[PDB]
Amino acid sequence: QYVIQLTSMFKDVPLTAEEVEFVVEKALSMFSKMNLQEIPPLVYQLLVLSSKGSRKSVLEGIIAFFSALDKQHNEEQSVPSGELRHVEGTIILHIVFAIKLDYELGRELVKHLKVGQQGDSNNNLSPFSIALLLSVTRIQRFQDQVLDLLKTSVVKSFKDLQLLQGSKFLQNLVPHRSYVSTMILEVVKNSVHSWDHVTQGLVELGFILMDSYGPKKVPSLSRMPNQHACKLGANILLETFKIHEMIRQEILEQVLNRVVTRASSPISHFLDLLSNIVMYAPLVLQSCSSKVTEAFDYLSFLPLQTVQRLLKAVQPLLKVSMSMRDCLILVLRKAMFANQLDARKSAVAGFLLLLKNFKVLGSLSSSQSHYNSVANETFCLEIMDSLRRCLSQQADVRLMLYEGFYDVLRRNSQLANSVMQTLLSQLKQFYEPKPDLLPPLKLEACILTQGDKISLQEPLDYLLCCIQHCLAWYKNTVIPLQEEEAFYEDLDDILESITNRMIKSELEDFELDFSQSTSIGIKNNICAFLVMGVCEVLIEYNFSISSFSKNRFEDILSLFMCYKKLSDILNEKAGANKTSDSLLSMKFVSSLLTALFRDSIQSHQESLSVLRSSNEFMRYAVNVALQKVQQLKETGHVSGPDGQNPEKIFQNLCDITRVLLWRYTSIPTSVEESGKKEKGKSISLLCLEGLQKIFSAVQQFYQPKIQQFLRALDVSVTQRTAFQIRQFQRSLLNLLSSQEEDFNSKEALLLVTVLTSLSKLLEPSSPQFVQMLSWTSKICKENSREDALFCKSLMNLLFSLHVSYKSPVILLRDLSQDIHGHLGDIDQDVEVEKTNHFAIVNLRTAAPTVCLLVLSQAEKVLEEVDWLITKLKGQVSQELPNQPVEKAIIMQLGTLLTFFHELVQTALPSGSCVDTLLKDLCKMYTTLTALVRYYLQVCQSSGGIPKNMEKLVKLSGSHLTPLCYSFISYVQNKSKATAMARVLRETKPIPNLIFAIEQYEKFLIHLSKKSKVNLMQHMKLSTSRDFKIKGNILDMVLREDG
Amino acid sequence: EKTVKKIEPGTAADSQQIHEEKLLYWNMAVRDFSILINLIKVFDSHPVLHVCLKYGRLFVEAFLKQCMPLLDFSFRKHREDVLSLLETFQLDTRLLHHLCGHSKIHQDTRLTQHVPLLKKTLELLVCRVKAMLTLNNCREAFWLGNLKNRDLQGEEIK
Amino acid sequence: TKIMQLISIAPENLQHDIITSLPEILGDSQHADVGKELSDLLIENTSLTVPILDVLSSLRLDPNFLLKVRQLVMDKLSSIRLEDLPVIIKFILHSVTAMDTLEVISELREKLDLQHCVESSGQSCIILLFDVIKSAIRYEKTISEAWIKAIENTAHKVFDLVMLFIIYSTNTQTKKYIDRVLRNKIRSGCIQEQLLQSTFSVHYLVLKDMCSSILSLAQSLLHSLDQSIISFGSLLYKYAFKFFDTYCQQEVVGALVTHICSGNEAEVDTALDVLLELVVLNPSAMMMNAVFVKGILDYLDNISPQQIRKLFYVLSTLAFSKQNEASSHIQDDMHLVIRKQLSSTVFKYKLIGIIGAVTMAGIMAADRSLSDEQCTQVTSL
DNA sequence: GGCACAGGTTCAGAGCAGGCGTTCCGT
DNA sequence: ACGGAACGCCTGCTCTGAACCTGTGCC
């Protein structure tokens, strides 16, 4: 090594021709043999000698050597030592000082590593290269440029992963070595070894990525490029916060600096990041007491959703700082009288959350505790007095209050002794004491009568809802767990009286049998909603306390009949108004469904015979289940209790799934035997609606517990779901083999939607996917029903399965002959018909419906093709495994050209379909131009051409090239300010097609010039058209116009 | 190209006294464009037809952008003159297509550079003529035919 | 009834006290009737009008009732002192619907009293106005966007320009949009040069709270190659240096040294010219700025020889503008480093050193129509 | 015979790529 | 002597969501 050092010292004189060879050959020689500790001195020698010139020649060598060392470590761990990282920490610092010394070096470095196109990276990135880029991000000049580079690289990589997961053809062709997302995670893991300069780069990259692509509308084009990418940013904001101790005190301020400030756009990802960091290590929040303190002053001017997670996050801080608690309660009580509605709702939610979290040490029931127990007690009681002030306010505050009292009672039991009394006071504000009196609700006091408008004041249905849930909780928990008990049974008596008077009630009391036209109708509609709500809450109560008594269930039936006629009257008034999220609790809905269908006990059956005698209630139970699942679709929370808990709601949802599936399975449609008015509204159709909705929701939300979900519904999940897809398949086969004149199209399309939703669960390589593919092929080839939507859904299912199984191009070609046979031809001198390919195609549905779907799938495979050839151009730019890939490309284009050649003679209807065909033709010829462009780069270097693309070019010229011009002529020949927009819209694609074709002509001419083969002889001359005007039609139309 | 580009299209609300001399100037411009274009044959050299391709696509693009709204506004009032100048531009378009075919036949990168955009704008003028017929409630009058591949001297080729 | 009895009978101080205490005393129910009755008092009396405006801003009333007081008070907005104003504009900004934003914004911008109004209480009131505007703009998005739309429709007032600066500072979403709007405005020529000087004269104290934002704005504008935008940026930089305290005078030079280190020809030329006129304006502030000239001298390689021809001009001028120990230790180290650069036999280092040394010698030797010691020193070097 | 349902059409905005522009080098 | 190539700026392409309306199917 002394020879290396003295030669390096002697080479300090300025030389270029021999110096570059000496430094690069010595560099690779020392990379191949030298010890690890001697690398950093050699690194210093080579980087200081390279300052004279030939910087990038040594830069590529050293970065490639460290990448190779990283891969060696990766395969070794998959000798290992911590010091392997530490020496790199000594190395990287010095070279970035060289980047600080020499700016042109950094300029050429960031210029070369720019991702010029999607394949130009070709995994040039690496953990060491990412660390170098982040260190460059430390320097201010290239900070924005390299940050934009990293952001674009992450977006491109996420798009590449989305395309790779979107089809198995790329998986068969391309390796799965493409990843930059896990690269940054590996860099974060490696930063444990004393890489502190890197941390600034990580936080800056994370913040720019997080705030760049966050949601703003509250994105299928950029679903994974944007949303998942934000999660990656969020992920690293977690990961560094777990690892680097010193940066923990920093990043939180930036988060707060966004969270209080950016109040307009959604900030939900930052909220979830804040919750996860404070949950992991709340102690750091003690450090930023000043920041949260100045944040609390803005609580009157934040969204409520920010306030919920922020106040949930700051609770460990509140457990210690009593002065900060006093300041918080001061700003809350000062925030009570703010006229802003959001400020009031925010303050009340903060009240409920904080009193929920402070545990009363005396007799509170378990969990899911400051030593000053009496201080906690008096604090909670004065907070309850503030709530007594709160309750007399506008309707939304009251609604939130009654929604949150159940969770308050669950996490804090002693305050119930006040809360119910407070609720009882509200009950005493509306419940008349005399049982002789008919109503339990006064419409005047219930509604906010006011000048020139009408609005809600206090939802009494929600009062009864909260009272019922609190009373049921206490009766179920505290009394069995065990001077002032009497009010409990008094409440029961109150509800009992509210039951009785209600069944004896009628529409005459409430003045019913009314819309937004007049205030009278507005208050009548609001009263209708209120009586419906309190009636169904009375159904909840009576079903709860009865324990299956005949008289109680008779009361339930009469009460529900009252509710049903109220709902029918409201619907007749409507014939926005109908949509009302019913107050039925999720646990009660599950229990009601299970009791209704699955029942064996004779004492239960005696009452349930009377209950089930009305099919209206049977429809209503499944209907409220549908409404609950549809509510769950848009958000995890639900209207009833236990909205926050995902485990509880999911475990309860399994019961309704299995019960409803049993209902549909064990009961055929013949058992219904109902009239045609309600046959469409038969409970089987509603059951299939619910099955479709829930099977779309379940894997969307509860991904990890799918195995337990399917196990509880009734080994590998494939063998498990084989059973369910088999029963659904048998039901579909029975339905589709029915009478040909008519069939339940709604039932069929719901069922095939259920098949499509459940099919994605299957592992593609298992035999179950093969069975589903074969059965779908049989159904398509054997059946032909007159319904566009049914055929469209079956085609979408078939393609979604097939693309996973293999490339769809053979199916494209086989469907091409069928569509060509069914539709016809533009010449009217050639006859074609081959109907045996797929009987599902039909002359009544082939043109408008099937053609759009098959063209869209064609466009998808061209998108895959142009991505792949772009990566080929990228690896060409990088520098013979590509031959089979090229052969696959040529085969795919050949068969899809055959598909085009078969369809293009067809006389499609004039409209959007021909426009999609023209656009997809443009896409095809542009991909061909890209293909010959790729050939231009490689064959010019090689000096010769293989024999495949020649066959492709000749078959393209024989099949499609003049046929395009003939079809364009047919398109114009096929005759029929606002219309100007449509006329200008329908003017582009026909020129665009010939532009693409001629572009291909130009590029293949260049290819012939640069490869010494006259490929133009294969293709014919560009036929071109000229317009003509029929003077006789002009004379006729002008004469009749005149 | 500059002179034809600078002239703006008169609106439909403009009187026919302002439309008529516009159409007369347009007819003169297309006529002298035709007699200028027909001088290519005498000199079949590389740079002259090379510049002719680029400036032909520029000229027809400008004609498309500007004249066609005037034709849309003033078809009924001046139908016969519109058809006459359209026929003259049809002759010019035939000459342009023949030049395109000659450029394509002779394998030459520089000549073929300006071909695809030329054919795009020419075809887009054809579809704009179809749009003009559609706007005037005479879409059925429109018709198409295939144009023979004649070389520069005016003789068909295989 | 009790509150109105106290209003009627009690004197000015007590009635004022119960009025400013009104939102806490009243519950939810009595908002509308009490609002109508205090509007009747507004019609009756004028002295207690401002506290009534305050509680009307605080209390919950519908827009339809607010319309009457808005119509009554908009007439008198042009004829109220500076001490009254911020709570009135607080009412106006927080008592407007979604559709009335542009109208009231244009009307209040037209009826501004600061032009004729502009002691220490006055400047305190002005920052109170700006704090009220910061509170209103930060969350009332429709008002924020309507401000830019209204001034874009208007297409010159200093108060509007300061509001534009703070709007750029606060709302991150309007960053690129307001940058483009400012570029369009200065390109149009509506923004004259004297109003910048008057703005920095009247609102120097307020502008410090977002001086970082104005430095970022001028830094963004430096990249633009338009001559008008470049002159605008130089004017903003020199005014910010000459008006603010030593703090912003330090961050401005800290930004300018990085701009010089960027190396772009337009940016480096503009930065050097700004630095030269800055040193001309007030070398006393620049005397404290010592590390920045050292950092300038360190990166000799990026700066081109044409720029180096006048780069040494500024440092030599501020060194030899006034004799001081500050100048002494600013001169000895630069003299040593250029001497050792010349000592190096490399032609590039010799070229940079000689170009620096000739300008240094000329600048120290030149004077208007110099002791014997100075003559000996310049001859010796 | 008209309602309620749905898919089509239209749109304005967000966001970005090639192709012009210019310069340098190969041809 | 001439052209393409390269790369910064810009227009104008492409999608996207939503509102909006007619047409359809049915009571």
Author numbering:
A (entry chain A): 172 to 249, 259 to 398, 408 to 557, 573 to 686, 694 to 724, 729 to 790, 797 to 935, 949 to 1113, ...
B (entry chain B): 1243 to 1400
C (entry chain B): 194 to 311, 336 to 372, 377 to 590, 602 to 613
Could you give the paper's own sentences about this structure?
To address these questions, we used our in vitro reconstitution approach (Arkinson et al, 2018; Rennie et al, 2020, 2021) to assemble a 1:1:1 IUbD2‐DNA complex, from purified IUb, D2 and dsDNA (61 bp long), and subsequently determined its structure by cryo‐EM. Our final IUbD2‐DNA map, made of 139,601 image particles, was at 4.1 Å global resolution and had a local resolution ranging from 2.8 to 13.9 Å. Interestingly, IUbD2 has the same closed‐on‐DNA conformation as IUbD2Ub and ID2Ub. The overall conformation of the IUbD2 complex is very similar to that of IUbD2Ub. The most noticeable differences are (i) slight movements of FANCD2 and FANCI helices in the region where FANCD2's ubiquitin interacts with FANCI and (ii) the high level of disorder in the FANCI N‐terminus proximal to that region (residues 1–170), upon loss of FANCD2 ubiquitination. We thus propose that the high level of disorder in the FANCI N‐terminus is a direct consequence of the loss of binding between the ubiquitin of FANCD2 and the N‐terminus of FANCI. We reasoned that the relative disorder in the N‐terminal regions of FANCI or FANCD2, in IUbD2‐DNA or ID2Ub‐DNA complexes, respectively, might be crucial for ubiquitination of FANCD2 or FANCI, correspondingly. Despite the slight movements of IUbD2's FANCI and FANCD2 towards the region where FANCD2‐conjugated ubiquitin would be, FANCD2's K561 is fully accessible for ubiquitination, when compared to its position in the ID2‐DNA complex (~80 Å2 buried; Figs 3B and EV3). In each case, ubiquitin's hydrophobic I44 patch is involved in interaction with the other ID2 subunit; however, the ubiquitin conjugated to FANCI forms a more extended interface with FANCD2 (Wang et al, 2020). This extended interface is formed predominantly via hydrophobic interactions of residues H209 (α10 helix), V243, P244 and D247 (α13 helix) of FANCD2 with residues T9 and K11 of ubiquitin and is further stabilised by hydrogen bonding between ubiquitin's T9 and R74 with FANCD2's H209 and S251 (or E217), respectively.
